[PDB]
Design a protein around this ligand. Structure first.
Ligand SMILES: *[C@@H]1O[C@H](CO)[C@@H](O[C@@H]2O[C@H](CO)[C@@H](O[C@@H]3O[C@H](CO)[C@@H](O)[C@H](O)[C@@H]3O)[C@H](O)[C@H]2NC(C)=O)[C@H](O)[C@H]1NC(C)=O
Ligand SMILES: *[C@@H]1O[C@H](CO)[C@@H](O)[C@H](O)[C@H]1NC(C)=O
Ligand SMILES: *[C@@H]1O[C@H](CO)[C@@H](O)[C@H](O)[C@H]1NC(C)=O
Ligand SMILES: *[C@@H]1O[C@H](CO)[C@@H](O)[C@H](O)[C@H]1NC(C)=O
Ligand SMILES: N[C@@H](CC(=O)O)C(=O)O
Ligand SMILES: N[C@@H](CC(=O)O)C(=O)O
Lengths: 141, 161, 161, 141
């Protein structure tokens, strides 16, 4: 899955995803990806977020909607994302999942669940700051 | 903190590149997000995006995609999009030619054909084989439960005991 | 304050009580939610639940339905269920028999059939009568926009401008 | 659609909906009803909520989820449901939508956007005190 967040020069935000799903899914299965509030969410008055991972589990907690909801409440993009991972985490300690967060002013961040086989989440950031995209990695929690 | 800003999941440099180029050309967030994801459908980023990857139980690949405008807070989405490669392209259409939000399955394919999308097979010898290896391993892993034969050991057809 | 409790939308009494009876026999909340909802499927409550009502542009009736286990927070959902009447019935089956959340379309029909659900046309003369008068009113209303021929005046098939 | 919320005596919650969509929808359309968090959502640590109305607008605001988040603060059901309706109301002054809320103790409530063609919402209720299913009603805001 590719989850993307974009804030136009004029301050407009958009979020989107495109995926082929999880391997060997039951014929007809739709995950969290095309679901507003689950796979991605965008709000010009708050921010945007996008999740990736075990959609079956993810979908049921609306990660992107809650990441934006916290940033709307006025929270650091990273802290909004980490809180979202912590809430699902409490319910599924071994769930595979990662989220990217970004507020209306251009600050961003991410968070992920710490598993034996996934301790870092790499995500691409392209910004005026560095006219060139640069991969970033956040340690999982 | 300065704009514009493109952030995407995974180290998919090319998608990031594709989206940024949209904005440069005068494109909007929507065009930027569509370019980023459409790029990962052609490239089949990790085989977790686009055609020829993650086949279901019957060996067919089905694509899920969505686009969301934060201004109007409108959404265009597709689920179980069958036989259409440019998923995010079709989702953008549901957003601009309908007042709906989600269109799914073989019904969503019709829609995409009406919009001008080429109806084609999403299978590839790679995914075709990825599925046979799966079947030979007695369908492991799968996502069933509380049925017979035991999902932890055999292939379907399944059924409640 | 007084438990147990049942709350449903709209004045559907027969459903409320079908749910209470479920609790009466010491049924689970989930059991109660399936019985109440399914009761409106048989009764086609206000023609907004169940078969023989609300036909799509092609005249077919497609059902959506979900059920959520508040304890584990597990979901069983069907979107675009074709040729299957007990929609929420199929939804409990996704909760109870797969590790998934949502299955859609003709694919969800094949799952439903394995679960023992009877494949059958969801159309009635009434559902179609509604479809024909609509055609006669030039498909007004409808959910398209920015397509030729004008969506506000003509019936499709439409093409993007 | 029939949105239904149930709280067993044990205190375990359930929620659910069943519908046939909105008349003359495009072939393959799926709305809020089957989407967890939008059409209905239930959590044993807070409460539940179901929604009915125009699924195309509602689905983007995850009414059932947000209603539950308010109640998760201890917000009264009528108010959590009322606040939700208002968030949407800002963006789409003419939206058709109604929601029923109930917290973990058995307190219920409901809310609806006031349109000149939708001024009051009737919902059924069933609990001990009354026994006999009672038809409630709320004036839209
Ligand atoms: C988007 O997220 C960023 C990062 O969380 C927010 O930026 C931070 O903004 C705060 C509030 O302006 C700044 O801290 C304040 O620092 C001043 C120093 O003069 C002090 O007076 C206050 O007591 C507090 O410490 C902080 O420096 C700044 N951090 C960064 C990294 O930029 C931003 O406000 C968020 N935007 C929105 C619209 O929510
Ligand atoms: C991105 O760059 C190349 C350039 O065409 C492309 O083949 C591939 O998708 C990506 N390559 C790598 C090494 O990630
Ligand atoms: C249940 O409700 C329907 C809906 O109008 C009504 O026609 C029917 O008589 C009721 N059935 C019973 C057993 O009361
Ligand atoms: C349920 O609603 C009433 C009214 O707001 C409140 O007093 C009660 O404490 C609520 N339950 C919980 C668990 O907060
Ligand atoms: N979210 C995807 C999986 C992924 O993000 O890789 C799905 O479950 O459909
Ligand atoms: N929410 C339903 C319709 C309704 O509940 O009135 C739908 O749009 O699918």
């Amino acid at each position: 899955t590719i989850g993307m967040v974009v804030i136009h020069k004029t301050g407009h935000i958009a979020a989107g995803t495109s995926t082929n799903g999880i391997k060997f899914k039951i014929h007809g299965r739709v995950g969290d990806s095309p679901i507003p509030g689950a796979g991605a969410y965008a709000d010009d008055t708050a921010g945007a977020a996008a999740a990736t991972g075990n959609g079956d589990i993810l979908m049921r907690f609306l990660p992107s909607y809650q990441a934006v909801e916290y940033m709307r409440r006025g929270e650091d993009p990273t802290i909004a994302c980490q809180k979202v991972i912590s809430r699902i985490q409490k319910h599924f300690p071994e769930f595979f999942g990662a989220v990217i967060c970004a507020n209306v002013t251009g600050s961003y961040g991410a968070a992920c669940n710490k598993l034996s086989t996934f301790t870092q989440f790499s995500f691409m950031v392209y910004n005026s700051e560095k006219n060139q995209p640069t991969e970033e990695k956040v340690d999982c929690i | 903190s300065p704009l514009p800003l493109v952030v995407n999941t995974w180290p998919f440099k090319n998608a990031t590149e594709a989206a940024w180029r949209a904005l440069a050309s005068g494109g909007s967030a929507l065009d930027a997000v569509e370019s980023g994801c459409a790029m990962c459908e052609r490239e089949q980023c990790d085989g977790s995006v686009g055609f020829g990857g993650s086949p279901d139980e019957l060996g067919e690949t089905t694509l899920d995609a969505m686009i969301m405008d934060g201004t109007t807070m409108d959404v265009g989405a597709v689920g179980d999009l069958r036989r259409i490669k440019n998923a995010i392209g079709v989702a953008r259409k549901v957003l601009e030619h309908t007042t709906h939000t989600l269109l799914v399955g073989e019904s969503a394919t019709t829609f995409a054909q009406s919009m001008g999308f080429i109806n084609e097979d999403l299978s590839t010898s790679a995914s075709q084989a990825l599925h046979s290896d799966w079947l030979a391993r007695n369908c492991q892993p799968n996502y069933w439960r509380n049925v017979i034969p035991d999902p932890s050991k055999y292939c379907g057809p399944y059924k409640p005991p």
